[PDB]
Amino acid sequence: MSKLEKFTNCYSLSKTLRFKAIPVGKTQENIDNKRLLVEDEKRAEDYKGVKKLLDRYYLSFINDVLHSIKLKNLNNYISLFRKKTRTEKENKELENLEINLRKEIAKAFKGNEGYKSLFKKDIIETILPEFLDDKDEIALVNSFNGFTTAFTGFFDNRENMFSEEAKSTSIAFRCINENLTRYISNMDIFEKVDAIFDKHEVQEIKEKILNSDYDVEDFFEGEFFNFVLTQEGIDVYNAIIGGFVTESGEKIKGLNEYINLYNQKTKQKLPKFKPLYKQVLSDRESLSFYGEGYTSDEEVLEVFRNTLNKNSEIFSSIKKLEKLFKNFDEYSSAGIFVKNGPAISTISKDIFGEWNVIRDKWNAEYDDIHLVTEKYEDDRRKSFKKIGSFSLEQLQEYADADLSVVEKLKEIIIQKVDEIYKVYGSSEKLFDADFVLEKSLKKNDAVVAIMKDLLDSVKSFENYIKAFFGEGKETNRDESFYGDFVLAYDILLKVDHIYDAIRNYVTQKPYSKDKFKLYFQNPQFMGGWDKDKETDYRATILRYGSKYYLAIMDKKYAKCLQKIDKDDVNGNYEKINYKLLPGPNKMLPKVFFSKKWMAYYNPSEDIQKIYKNGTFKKGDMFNLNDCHKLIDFFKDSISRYPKWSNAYDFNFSETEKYKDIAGFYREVEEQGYKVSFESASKKEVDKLVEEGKLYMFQIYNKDFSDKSHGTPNLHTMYFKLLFDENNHGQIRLSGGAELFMRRASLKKEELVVHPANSPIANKNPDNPKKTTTLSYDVYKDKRFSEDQYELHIPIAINKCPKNIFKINTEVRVLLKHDDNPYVIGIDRGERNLLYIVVVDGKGNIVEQYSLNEIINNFNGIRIKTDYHSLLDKKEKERFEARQNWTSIENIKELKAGYISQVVHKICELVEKYDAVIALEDLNSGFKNSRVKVEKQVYQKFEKMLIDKLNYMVDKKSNPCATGGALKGYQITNKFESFKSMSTQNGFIFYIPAWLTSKIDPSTGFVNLLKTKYTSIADSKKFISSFDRIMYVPEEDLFEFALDYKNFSRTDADYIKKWKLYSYGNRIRIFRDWEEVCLTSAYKELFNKYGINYQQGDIRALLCEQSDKAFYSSFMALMSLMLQMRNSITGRTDVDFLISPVKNSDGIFYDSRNYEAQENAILPKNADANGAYNIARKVLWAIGQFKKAEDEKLDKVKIAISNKEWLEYAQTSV
RNA sequence: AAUUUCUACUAAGUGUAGAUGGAAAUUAGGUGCGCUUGGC
DNA sequence: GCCAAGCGCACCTAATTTCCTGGAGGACG
DNA sequence: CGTCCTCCA
Ligand SMILES: [Mg+2]
Ligand code: NA
Known part of the structure; x- marks a missing residue:
């Protein structure tokens, strides 16, 4: 067995498949004649308009609540929040006061009697019209009467604003978790910086920004925070901090400007204030003036x-x-x-x-x-x-x-x-x-x-x-x-x-029309796929051979496919018969305690009392014996409920075995799904499309072409598997599909053309067939030159997971009992975007290479793509565009393109070696400071890797095999957010990066000396702390014998005693680069000051110098000697790692001796060294899992300390 | 230089290889330029 | 020539929420 | 009552 195969069917996730929808037969003309697409395009514009009128209401509703709020928990929270020694129980009370502060905001909205009606048809039907004045605005809203179902999702998006939970789209979250945290941090900064502001400047902010109704200091007392809950107050508060620009152009200074001026004047470094984030749904108008622009x-x-x-x-x-x-x-x-x-x-x-x-x-x-x-x-x-x-x-x-x-x-x-x-x-x-x-x-x-x-x-x-x-x-x-x-x-x-x-x-981007949603005059168009709702949704799926079709009944003919029977003789389509019983824990009470059903089947007071009281649900009123009698009431009502009874062949368990009600609901959920196909006469169905009663589109991508012959897209496999008999609910077809029209955006005549019978240049230099000649024209961007329908189909994977364990725990267990676990270490960078090193459980390098270039072999042909070069070009094209007022091209598709190849290689590596992945624990504050280098790939790499590992499929595998499309691996936890990640995400471990690159892999040596020049006396003390400094005639090298215990803050080192040599060259960086030959430079320096550097031990002699320049140039040379990593900026040809220490056999490690070898035992360069040692820092974590009992594996700390790392690195060899 | 879409192709001739969670909402960031006052 | 604090404008990128539903129930001719 | 849109959780 492998470790991967324990990780199938762990959790559910949803995805969306996308297809072109090709009109069949007369459907396009019939759609043309009825002008359906014009109606839908207008509806999308009007829909956005109504959505704006609704926000104007929601905002007025928000601002009236928020303007009238006085936070109760406020002063207790601010007190405890500013405490600098908090016990654990105080931390818990802080979290409770934070929760209560948000519940205070959520209840002030949701305690409104009319709150519920803000998300039903009442807001469109009644509320918003009475609130409006414009006749035309009111008529726009009225045009969606009888169509308010089209707003269901938008109402959810608005509901989210009033959640009490610490969730990113919540008003409460914005107020308390975000803006109150900055406001409190600013109070501390005010108490430190207060004195820097003179009377005039505080008065100027008071007069021009505070309307003379407030003192600046007021907005740095805890009680004033309620002023800052609405955009109004946020604007004033951010203006205190940042100032504003008057109608005449004068820039009035805010507090941060005065702090910066003071810093710059005194060469100090006082902290600056942070501005508050915006109020959710606010229509922001700036407080600074800015003149009118041009519009044509x-x-x-x-x-x-x-x-x-x-x-x-x-x-x-x-x-x-x-x-x-x-x-x-x-x-x-x-x-x-x-x-x-x-x-x-x-x-x-x-x-x-x-x-x-x-x-x-x-x-x-x-x-x-x-x-x-x-x-x-x-x-x-x-x-x-x-x-x-x-x-x-x-x-x-x-x-x-x-x-x-x-x-x-x-x-x-x-x-x-x-x-x-x-x-x-x-x-x-x-x-x-x-x-x-x-x-x-x-x-x-x-x-x-x-x-x-x-x-x-x-x-x-x-x-x-x-x-x-x-x-x-x-x-x-x-x-x-x-x-x-x-x-x-x-x-x-x-x-x-x-x-x-x-x-x-x-510099504005020119207007580009978006695709728009098609409704076929149905406010719940294609809502779902259930048979007993075909008439309401008016969309179904058909199959004729390998080809699939979307079928839409006209608003006037919803039943036209209900009639049609088999044509025993001639050909037939297969029409889907889809039944789904979603959320039985909600649907079962709703169906079997309805007035419609309670008429037919009356509850016992036994049955009735439970659901009213709630002794069926695990909790505080739980009572096991009632669930059983209720499970049977439900089970006995399923028998008498025909549309469910004959749709799903139920096979429940002996009731006496259910531990709670959810044990029942799960069996209903898994069995409440069935998909079959019945015959329908192709003659009659075709005539329906002919007569205009039915619309028919082929669900298409290139793998359905008559000329397709290669491996299909993974998504094509998913779609066909939806209807494969071997799919037992691993992938379900979901509701909520959508159909869109994307108008052509290029003219055919304006397209780059490769005309038939003229040879085309192949672009791949490793392709020996240099030319291709076809008998038909080929157009660039052909698909954007005609109108296109697209169909978006949601699917659900592993809806009923059977392998529920904490995924992280299971990995630690598996690592513990694995005799030789492999690690894929991955160094993130910008000289090398990604660098890969695979090690075995003993730390031998098995594979190592950069990923600046993607090497692919197919059909004997080799292809190399230098994506680091391509991204570099894109990054420069964008810089130039920005300065030149020319078109700024996208880079994210190219990044995604590159990253997909990387992730494919990594998945292959994971499968080949049953390996776990080692990454730098890069805090998010580092990852943003490198976004300015638009090669930046750090976070997108993470997102796409983690996504793929949520459901990792080998496309080539058999779909029923482990790792195939129906049984994907789930070796990362379900991606919810970066916010909530730990240092382990299943197979991915994030470890401390410290000294993974700037370390000699062959000795473990690292530079723990502080060698910046500070003073003559410090330089003398530094020189004197070496045990010996001497020239070595028989090697033409200078030797510097040191014991690290004689030097400041070197405790992490384990070996302590080292002999440094002036061996090889170094690249000095300064503002440019120069190469330095270390021995020759030391001779130049000593000769410049008359130093007789042959006099055995020379450190006393060196301390006789009086010139500051000597000691300064000497510290600089020491730094270059201890600088093991050396490279030229923006360069492939130099990134070598060289050590001033000898290994046990007396040789200096020099990556360039390994960069030559195709199969190197040691890292080939500094980036490889980083990936290698990142992997080993995880090998150490695996060592920790082996030291610990299984009961306690979850608590093993995986972050090697700096002292444990040097010991580990210096005893590996 | 063809695509559900994206990247790279032409891959043997209307396509090849890999990837691909959509939709809506909210919000934040980065780059570049201009202006204000300043610092090497 | 470089850089800081702040205001503005243009662009592209991206984090994190929610839904991925059939059947009861109502409004209406 | 038959049909279509809304509402529930
Ligand atoms: Mg293919
Ligand atoms: Na900016």
Whole structure:
């Protein structure tokens, strides 16, 4: 036996199969003539409208409750929440006060008498109309009378808002778990940071943000939190923190701005506040002003031409500012000023090449006067900070003999004006009055590039100009320059709103129609599949051979398939006969205590008293003997209930054996499902479609083509298995199917075509058949060029699981008693997206390779796909698009594509080796800081892996075999959320990543030294703590003998005593890279300071140095020597791992000696080393399971400590 | 360069290989650019 | 040239809820 | 009463 096969039929899950629906015969014309698709497209728009009118009600309902709430538990919860020493029982009381706070919110909604009617037809029929005023809005709502069933799901989505549970879509959850937690964390930050705010700034927030009705401090007391339950108060509170922008553009500072300024001014690091999340269903309007944008291509072109032609004022303002600078000499250089700050940085760079040069020259002249250095540089920085402005004459001081500042400036303005003209010559045709654009602006990259290139050059000019404004408050200021310069600068600034607004419009995605749902004039269309509901749902399934069909009865002919009999002679369709008894624990009481049934069969008061009282259910009023007499009442009513009695061949148990009522309900549930097919005359059914009484679509994907001949999609197997006699409820067909129309979005004529009989280039370089020639055209994206029906079919897998155990526990047990358990270790990364190492129970490397490339072999042909390269390209295409205002392509499909191959390889690995999976326990705070690197695959990899392992099927297996489609493996727990995961998800273990990569696999050696240069005396103490430092002539290496117990915070190490050598090279990273030969660099350093490095033990000699640079360069070299991992950024060709320690045979581990070998015993590179040691850290956890009794396996801690890891790693060898 | 959809193909000629939980709702994040005030 | 706090706009990505129902019951001609 | 939409849990 294997460990996998114990994991079938563990839990239920639902999935959706999707198909094209192809109209058969006259159905399309009959659908055309009745205009069914037009009705459905309009209904979808109106449906979204009504959904908006309903929210306007729900929101008003929400805000009236929330505005009137005073939380009772509040002050007790805030008290206990801020306690810093909580006993376990206090933690429990905290959770109880959190629960009670949410129940307080849920009851304030649900205690309303009319609460229930907010989710039945009353809200559409009555409530929402009386609440509305617009005649047209009211008529829109009324148009769904008799159709409110179409809102059942939407009512569930709205119900969710009022749950008391800690669930993400709940108002209560948003208020208490999320916003109250931030509010309380902000109270602490207020008490720390309070003093930094002066009286003026607190008053400004009070006057402009608090309407002068509150003090800023009030929103940091516990009692004020009720103010913040509605979007209104959230807005005010986030404005205290972040400020706002006035109608005139002034940015009023919030508290976080003042904290940042203070930090930046004092070089401190005080914490900032967090803003509160939004109120559920709020219609948010910002408190900051932002001007009106543009709404059409024509408007944009008119604005662009009115405001930017040669004769426009903005152009003229440039021709003034040019002619002005071009005549600098008529104005006194002592009177034109560059404000100190960014303006001097800009001007420093344009004239001296670097931003800091003017500050540098200033510092040099300061030193000339004033010459401890910690205050000096700071006192001098302060004195330089006290300067507000710098004249042009003053700057000429800093010019050098050949340089003249004024002359250099006017070159720069000509350089930027010539750049502006340059772009105008390319913008000639765009200014023509006769110009009209063929392509829409949001699809016309050529026109937008002309517009953006022009706008950019004008912006570039504007930022240069702005540095010449100075502080402005200068007494010396030359108003014969300023006066006109300010008139022209103020009109130029008008290009700011234009630039923003043009980018805001031009970058919008163009409108794309969504598919829409088809109802066939039925508010419960295709609701389910039960025979006794065919007439209400008016949709069934048919089979003719291998082909399947959806059959829809017209609103006027619901019974037309009830009549049809076998055509004994000619051919016949098979019509499905589907019966389902869902949720017997609810349906059985409802059916057999109905007024319809209690007439026929009267209860005993015995029978009646139980269900009224409830002595049938396990709980506090439980009484076993009553369930038995009730199970039989039900069992005796099933006999007399014909539509159930003859639909399911029941075979119950001896009643005396049921332990509770649920033991009965489970047998009804499993047996309440049956699917068969009866004959129907194909002549009559066809004529029904002909006469328009029946609509017929073939349920299609490519595996049903007459030309299909390969392995079908897993989903095609699922679908056919729905109706296979060997499927005994492993996969049930579910209700809630849906049919949609997706209008074509490409024109056939506009499609890339490969014409018949002209050879097509094959793209796979390992494919020896270089060309393919077909006799028919082949079109790119062909499927989007015609309207398409799609059918979405829900299915349910393992609805009645028989293998109920805690999945994690079972894995630990199985690992304990497994003589040689294999591990697949997986290192997550971005140099290598994924890297795989498989080990055996003894830690031997069995397989190792990167997954940057997917190698697939089929039909003798090999194919390699460098997905790391493909994602890299996509990531760069998107960066460029963002900066260029061009189309931002998706990356997530490509990620999914890549990840699917990865997951397929991993599943094969799991099956081949019966192996469990080892991953880094990456906290979610690490995984978000790498989302900026859009190669990022960490979390999507996890989701798709965990999903597949919820029901893992070998498509090639026999469907009835273990691991086949009817008996999939479930070796991860049912995916509910990341929120709720532990460090073990069945076969997946998450272990501490610490020192899995930066460790010498052949010795266990790690770098536990702190080698940042801090001071001369610390460097002397560091050098002196080695047992010996000497040059080794016979090896041309420097040896550094250390005992780790002589060094700070090295306790984790186990071996303690090491001899380090200057062996090989290293890649130093700095801002770029350089290669360093360690021995040669040590010789350079010692020679630079006259050091006789041949004098045996040399550390006393080294401590005789007085130069700080020696000790600093020496610590740097030590760091490079202890830097075992070495790579070049964005590079395949360098990622080697090299150790400064010898192994027992006196050789240095160097991954590059193993990267060569096809079958390496040790890791081939640093990423392999990481995956390898992640796997071993799980091998250790398996060692812990072996140390423990089975009763206690659930409590074995799996996170190896850092000290246990170094001992483990250093005694493996 | 074809697809229920996606990725990679052409795979022997209207397709091949692997993956594929939909629908609705709510909410959050990341990138990029502009503006405000600031820090090397 | 780099970066911080905050406001805005455009885009794409993604976490976590819910349902995956037939038969009684009502409203209506 | 026969039909169609709503409601239950
Ligand atoms: Mg196939
Ligand atoms: Na942003």
